C-alpha cells in the first residue's frame, strides 16, 4: 500500500475537525471540507456568512444541476438547511477522478460553522441510511465508488499536534491523511485489527469490555453500546453514555486522586494548567476498549494515553504554560469514538468487507514511558449479547 499523493492531505485539529480540500462545478471552485464519518450528507456553504471566507456559487457552474428539493440536517450540535442539487466534484490531493455527486447548498446555518475553523463544507462519509432527506440520496463516497475505479475503502490518520494551534499554524501544519481507496503502509506501526460493522448506517461497532489501567469497569457490556457505538471523525471527544461516564470518571479520579480537581473540570467546563514541560502524564490512567473481533469468541483491544483524552488548549493568560480541557464527555445516545480516540490510530473503513481496522498511528502523541496500542487476540464470550436492540 503506497499512495504518496494523499499523504498529508488533511489539515485541522480535534477541536474544530479535520478537513480536506475539494473542488466543485465547472469551472471548479475550491472549498475546504470537513471529513465526517458521523453523517452521510455532502453539503457546502452557498451564501455569505460571518465565518466563511468563501462559498459555492451555483450560478457559476455550467454543470450544476438543481434538484428542486430542500433539505434539513440536524447534527448533535449545530444544524443547517439548504437546497439539493448535483455537480462535478474532485479532490486535488486524492485520486485524479471527477464524479457527479449530490451536494447540498447550505443557505441557513445555526451553530454549525466555527469561527476561523477554516472549512466551508462537510463531507459525510457514512452510509445512506442516515442521509437526509432519505436513503435514496446517494452519499458522496457511494457515488465515488459507483462511477470510478476507486475501491470501496478509505482510511484516516488524524494527527494531533501535541500542543495548541493558531489559525496560522493549523493552515501551515500537517493535520493528517485521508487515504482514498487504499491503505498506506507507512502511516501505521504494528498490525491491523478489524472489528465488524454491526449495521451499515453510522459506522457502528460493539464494545465488549472496558478497562482503566487494566481494571475492568465490571458492567453488563450492553451498557457500553446503549444504544449504539460509533466511530466519528467529526466528534471531538470520546463521548460516553451516562451510567458509563460516571463510572469511568470515578475510576480516573481514583487513579490520579493524588490530586482532587475542580468539579467543573470533569464536566469539561474548566481547564487545568501545569508549568511548561511539567505535565504529570504518568499519574494519569490509560483506557482500554476491547472491540468485537472477526471470528467467534475473538476480540482485540485498543489503548489510549492521557495525551489522547486531555485536549491541549491555548491559555490566553500566562500562555507560557501548558493547559488542557478534559476530552471525555457524557452522552445520551450511545458511545462515540471521537477524534481524541482516533488521533492514536490509523483507522481503516473497509466498507467493502463490512469492517473497521485499527493500527497504531505512526504520528501519534506519546511520552518516553508508555505508548498507545492495538493488541490481540483476546477471548470473550457471547459478544453478540453486548449489542443493544430496539
Amino acid at each position: 500500500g503506497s499512495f504518496v499523493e494523499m499523504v498529508d492531505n488533511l489539515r485541522g485539529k480535534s477541536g474544530q475537525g479535520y478537513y480536506v480540500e475539494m473542488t466543485v462545478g465547472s469551472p471548479p471552485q475550491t472549498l475546504n471540507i470537513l471529513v465526517d464519518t458521523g453523517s452521510s450528507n455532502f453539503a457546502v456553504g452557498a451564501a455569505p456568512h460571518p465565518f466563511l471566507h468563501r462559498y459555492y456559487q451555483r450560478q457559476l457552474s455550467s454543470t450544476y444541476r438543481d434538484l428542486r428539493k430542500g433539505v434539513y440536517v440536524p447534527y448533535t450540535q449545530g444544524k443547517w438547511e439548504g437546497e439539493l442539487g448535483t455537480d462535478l466534484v474532485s479532490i486535488p490531493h486524492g485520486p485524479n477522478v471527477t464524479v457527479r455527486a449530490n451536494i447540498a447548498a447550505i443557505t441557513e446555518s445555526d451553530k454549525f460553522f466555527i469561527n476561523g475553523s477554516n472549512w466551508e463544507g462537510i463531507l459525510g462519509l457514512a452510509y445512506a441510511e442516515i442521509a437526509r432527506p432519505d436513503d435514496s440520496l446517494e452519499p458522496f463516497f457511494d457515488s465515488l465508488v459507483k462511477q470510478t475505479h476507486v475501491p470501496n475503502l478509505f482510511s484516516l490518520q488524524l494527527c494531533g499536534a501535541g500542543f495548541p494551534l493558531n489559525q496560522s499554524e493549523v493552515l501551515a501544519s500537517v493535520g493528517g491523511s485521508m487515504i482514498i481507496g487504499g491503505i498506506d503502509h507507512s502511516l501505521y506501526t504494528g498490525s491491523l485489527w478489524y472489528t465488524p460493522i454491526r449495521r451499515e448506517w453510522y459506522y457502528e461497532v460493539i464494545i465488549v469490555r472496558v478497562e482503566i489501567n487494566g481494571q475492568d469497569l465490571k458492567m453488563d457490556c450492553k451498557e457500553y453500546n446503549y444504544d449504539k457505538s460509533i466511530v466519528d471523525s467529526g466528534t471531538t471527544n470520546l463521548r460516553l453514555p451516562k451510567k458509563v461516564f460516571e463510572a469511568a470518571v470515578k475510576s480516573i479520579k481514583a487513579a490520579s486522586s493524588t490530586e482532587k480537581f475542580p468539579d467543573g473540570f470533569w464536566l469539561g467546563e474548566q481547564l487545568v494548567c501545569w508549568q511548561a514541560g511539567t505535565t504529570p502524564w504518568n499519574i494519569f490512567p490509560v483506557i482500554s476498549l476491547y472491540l468485537m473481533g472477526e471470528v467467534t469468541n475473538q476480540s482485540f483491544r485498543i489503548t489510549i494515553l492521557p495525551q489522547q483524552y486531555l485536549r491541549p488548549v491555548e491559555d490566553v493568560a500566562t500562555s507560557q504554560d501548558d493547559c488542557y480541557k478534559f476530552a471525555i464527555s457524557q452522552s445520551s445516545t450511545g458511545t462515540v469514538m471521537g477524534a481524541v480516540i482516533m488521533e492514536g490510530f490509523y483507522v481503516v473503513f473497509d466498507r467493502a468487507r463490512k469492517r473497521i481496522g485499527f493500527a497504531v498511528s505512526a504520528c501519534h502523541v506519546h511520552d518516553e514511558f508508555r505508548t498507545a496500542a492495538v493488541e490481540g487476540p483476546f477471548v470473550t464470550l457471547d459478544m453478540e449479547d453486548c449489542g443493544y436492540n430496539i
Binding site: 475537525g17 458521523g38 440536517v73 440536524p74 466528534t235 471531538t236 471527544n237
Partner: peptide
C-alpha cells in the same frame, strides 16, 4: 468542540 448527525430531531 465538534459533534457531527442526529437521529430524528
Amino acid at each position: 468542540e465538534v459533534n457531527x448527525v442526529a437521529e430524528x430531531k
